[PDB]
Design a protein around this ligand. Sequence first.
Ligand SMILES: Cc1[nH]n(C)c(=O)c1C(=O)c1ccc2c(c1C)c(=O)n(-c1cccc(Cl)c1)c(=O)n2C
Ligand SMILES: Cc1[nH]n(C)c(=O)c1C(=O)c1ccc2c(c1C)c(=O)n(-c1cccc(Cl)c1)c(=O)n2C
Ligand SMILES: [Co+2]
Ligand SMILES: [Co+2]
Lengths: 380, 380
Amino acid sequence: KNPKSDKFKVKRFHHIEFWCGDATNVARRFSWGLGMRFSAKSDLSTGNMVHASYLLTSGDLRFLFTAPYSPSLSAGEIKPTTTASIPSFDHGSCRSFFSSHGLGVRAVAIEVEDAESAFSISVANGAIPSSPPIVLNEAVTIAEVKLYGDVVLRYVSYKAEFLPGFERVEDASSFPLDYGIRRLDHAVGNVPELGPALTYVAGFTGFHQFAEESGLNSAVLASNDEMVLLPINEPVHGTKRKSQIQTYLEHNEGAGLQHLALMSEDIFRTLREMRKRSSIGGFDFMPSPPPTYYQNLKKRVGDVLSDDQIKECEELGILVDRDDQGTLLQIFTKPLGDRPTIFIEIIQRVGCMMYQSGGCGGFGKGNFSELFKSIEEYEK
Amino acid sequence: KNPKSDKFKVKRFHHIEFWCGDATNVARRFSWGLGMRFSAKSDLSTGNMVHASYLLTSGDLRFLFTAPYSPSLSAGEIKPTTTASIPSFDHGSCRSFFSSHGLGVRAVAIEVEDAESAFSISVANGAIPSSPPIVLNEAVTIAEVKLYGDVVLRYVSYKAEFLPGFERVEDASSFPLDYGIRRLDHAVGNVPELGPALTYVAGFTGFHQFAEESGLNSAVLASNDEMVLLPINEPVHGTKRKSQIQTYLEHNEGAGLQHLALMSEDIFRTLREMRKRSSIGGFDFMPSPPPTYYQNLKKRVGDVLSDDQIKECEELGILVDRDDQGTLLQIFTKPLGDRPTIFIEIIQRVGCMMYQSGGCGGFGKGNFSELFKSIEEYEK
Ligand SMILES: Cc1[nH]n(C)c(=O)c1C(=O)c1ccc2c(c1C)c(=O)n(-c1cccc(Cl)c1)c(=O)n2C
Ligand SMILES: Cc1[nH]n(C)c(=O)c1C(=O)c1ccc2c(c1C)c(=O)n(-c1cccc(Cl)c1)c(=O)n2C
Ligand SMILES: [Co+2]
Ligand SMILES: [Co+2]
């Protein structure tokens, strides 16, 4: 059941912004590891004396990497005279964020019809303001409210390339890497208490609950057409194995973004290309399930994937789960940085054709049971 | 003239430690960009609750990348009970360093016969102590004194693999990259005033002055056998073109390490391999000199390099200079991170065979004149 209760018109995920200590090195690592092209920049070479911001793109996916310069470069500036291309940026907030959380997502940005009204309505409905709406070059409006922890939900709206003050990256330095990643499917937060976090976010957006041993309780908030998907986890305490949500909260110094799920148009190509690079600058993947997991795959998805396509899942370590409407292929990276906090999920969904409807196949919660079962079966 | 006045027995460069906000991403970038293998780690997986440290190696070159965890993980510890593998590490110092300077070198480590006596004699001779000698697992002694800015000179000595508490990296995750880099040739600091910096460092080490429009005055301090080379720059003000040393000091928030020069055993292979990766996660190089620079190369190094070997310098953008004793091939990367501060130089020296003596061919200061001359000749 979809009540379609969005309090303002939401379009799609627009971008994700990481707050870094050095944007250059994080961006170059991610680009090689994920096959994302350098698309735009705002930094000293573009007159930005405040922050270095580098945009990576793959399909519709936009990863932004931002780090502060010395405050001394911009000490004469005031907000009316700022050279920052992102007016919500603040040296002190960025340094506090990074020293507290390490590398992670500061902003989940969604595109809306009107960022001013989205901000106004959100705040009128309980959203904690973070940065008021600001009109960039009379062309783009940007505004921010608190989402969870120190993560903001960023509203972006266009009257009619990324943001004003960003320059398109020179073709010589913009190598057309592409491993098949095309868009952000969902972005997941970890919080100490799921209830109040759900009530807050659904309260100011009008997002609805998406119809869906693991150490977590979760729920998914969704926009009207269910293309903007914001799941939220809390830990389950007292268990035999320490909740990974709790471990996240400890090492992250509290709530924050847990994983980004990136849709691939060809998850086999993506995983082949990412795994080729795992030990030469890219990303590592979680240990593969035992082969009994794949011997059990014929029984439950044998009508969707061929024996060959299942074998290909086995060499790449891909997981498979199934809704009543679709099928889910997924795999998880190891954490993106020093701390056991943020990681990435690569995903491909099959089914639910009308275009494909959002969340087709679910989010893989059935893979907890299948892995536990598989584990003890490999032992046997 | 070499007075051989070292006040304690110095061996070779041992390692360089970068202080980072996320050691993982910087290390993975550098590994791919420079062709250095992941050799050892000290982090959560090895019981270090204080800092994440990753060691990259190429030949004898050792790059260490370190970042702090949340202080909360180690809040119950005291120095006697520390789980830090590098006892000089301090969360507050590392965060202050990185927020002030951005990504850069914290420690220039040299191996000495006895790090305790090196520390004692240095301090008795004016060195500002940074971290007293500490004996690690009765096997390695480490001690630190201030070098310039917030950079320390780290003394390491072994009674008899990197440091205790570091683990050798698993072969599966340790890909044997190698682009020909073999050792650190020299490490260069920028300071506001050369005189007092020279007097201080030569004062506590006994290092001697190495017999050698650009915006800099410099001098090189050298150990007895001139394998440890520590040049120091100050800016020249008032010039037409703003001194790059001054620009460094402004963006770095003061004195610090300007460049690391890495010796290659095959600079053509190294540059081919690095340039292949410049736009896919590696390092960029400074704009190549005009072809008139290479048409002028026959006249001055035509007895050392063949027409072919000179042509190969032209496609790779390599610079060439010459002493009265040897010849210098060199090239410079763009800055390693967000700020126009630290960069890397790749170098190969030919001549001065006895083994090769240190600093053979000099450091390339004649390439300022050759570039200015070449520039106006390309205009003509
Ligand atoms: C469950 C879930 N709900 N929503 C909204 C989602 O997006 C989402 C997923 O994406 C998802 C699905 C299945 C998962 C995992 C995740 C994150 C996961 O992290 N782990 C895991 C892996 C290694 C170590 C540990 Cl402790 C745990 C799993 O075993 N399975 C099976
Ligand atoms: C001079 C020097 N003394 N000592 C101890 C050394 O190690 C060392 C060198 O390594 C060295 C040598 C030649 C150089 C440069 C360097 C760093 C250099 O940075 N630039 C440069 C390049 C781009 C922009 C600007 Cl402004 C300047 C040059 O043009 N030349 C020619
Ligand atoms: Co997910
Ligand atoms: Co040099």
